[PDB]
Amino acid sequence: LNLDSIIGRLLEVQGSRPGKNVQLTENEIRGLCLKSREIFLSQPILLELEAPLKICGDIHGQYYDLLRLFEYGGFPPESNYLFLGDYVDRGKQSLETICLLLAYKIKYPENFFLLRGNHECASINRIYGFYDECKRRYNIKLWKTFTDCFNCLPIAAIVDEKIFCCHGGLSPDLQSMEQIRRIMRPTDVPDQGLLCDLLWSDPDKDVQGWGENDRGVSFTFGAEVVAKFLHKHDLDLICRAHQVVEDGYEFFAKRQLVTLFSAPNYCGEFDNAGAMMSVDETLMCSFQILKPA
Ligand SMILES: */C=C/C(=C/C(=O)C[C@H](C)C[C@@H](C)CC[C@H](O)[C@H](C)C(=O)C[C@@H](O)[C@H](C)[C@@H](C)OC(=O)C[C@@H](O)/C(C(=O)O)=C(\C)C(=O)O)CC
Ligand SMILES: [Cl-]
Ligand SMILES: [Cl-]
Ligand SMILES: [Cl-]
Ligand SMILES: [Mn+2]
Ligand SMILES: [Mn+2]
């Protein structure tokens, strides 16, 4: 596995007009999946990380916006990174996006971290773009290889015992952190339960307790659910993604929860910005932003 040649070819399109492809070989991508799969399984499903680090939200195959994020925050390993999921679907270059993230995960396994989003489930990315991109530019056998790799991704992370990070949000079945550590890998994403909620649920300011979710799966939760959860587990903040927001970041429940979305001009329809959160040594949060077109 010529990791440096793979990374060099991926960063080579820096400065080009967005849309230009990086077509790695079939065997190189297969090696990225298998090797990163081993590292995911060797590390806990509930990561315990330390600040300072940068946290990014949804990317959704917007590869040149991912390159802009590294230009703003520093290419690895100049800064520690935690991504919250949703690397494929919706966008035009899911392949370049996930390949660079897997390559960086292999080269810097203890300074680069990737969480699982709801689009890292096979039933979702079969419909919303990644399957068609794999079938067109490679083959469906490689798509299954990606799927086997996604099945081993960690699902949550706690930064310095104070910031709880996951893709979606909280769960009515989440009573102990040990419930997350007991989840065995590899695994598919069920249509209900704790693992489903951590990848699907959303906060809602017009809901008391647990409500229904407009996505057709999981639940919504209100501000008091967040406050009680933080107090019970001695936490300061819940950091999640999952929802496109106009400013790229959006606080909730008196700045006790923050939503991160790192894909500006989301799939050509929205005029949103993309945000990346910077956590310093004292856990103070600031933002670097890709402003909309
Ligand atoms: C792992 C496999 C698996 C998945 C399931 O659980 C399937 C569930 C039971 C049923 C399917 C039909 C749910 C699919 C969702 O409805 C889709 C993915 C969805 O969320 C569309 C989204 O637009 C909903 C409808 C919308 C109300 O939410 C938003 O607007 C959020 C917005 O940020 C967003 C997004 O999806 O992130 C947008 C605008 C987007 O569509 O890209 C088990 C079988
Ligand atoms: Cl509530
Ligand atoms: Cl900025
Ligand atoms: Cl500006
Ligand atoms: Mn999502
Ligand atoms: Mn998303």
* Residues spanned by the domain of 208: 1-293
Angstrom distance (rounded) from CA 222 to CA 144: 37
Q: Which ligand is nearest to the CA of 276?
A: 3
Angstrom distance (rounded) from CA 174 to CA 219: 13
Is 167 among the annotated ligand-binding positions? Answer: yes
State the structure-solving technique: X-ray
Contact 211, 204 (CB under 8 A): yes
Q: Is 231 a catalytic residue?
A: no
Cβ < 6 A, ligand 1 pocket: 90, 121, 123-124, 189, 191, 214-217, 243-244
Angstrom distance (rounded) from CA 110 to CA 81: 10
Structural domain tally of the chain?
1
Please give the structure tokens belonging to residue 206.
Answer: 């017009």
Is 233 among the annotated ligand-binding positions? Answer: no
Helix (H, G, I), strand (E, B) or coil at 290: strand
CA 193 to chain centre: 20
- How far, in Å, is the centroid of ligand 5 from the Cα of 243? 7
User: Residues whose CB is under 5 A from ligand 3 (ion)?
Assistant: 288-289
Ordered DSSP codes for 140-209: HHHHHHHHHHHTT---EEEETTTEEEESS---TT---THHHHT--SS-PPPSSSHHHHHHH-EE-TT-SS
CATH value at residue 254? 3.60.21.10
> Kind and range of the H or E element at 46?
strand 46-49
Resolution in A: 2.2
User: Residues whose CB is under 5 A from ligand 6 (ion)?
Assistant: 58, 86
For ligand 1, atom 6, the nearest C-alpha belongs to: 191
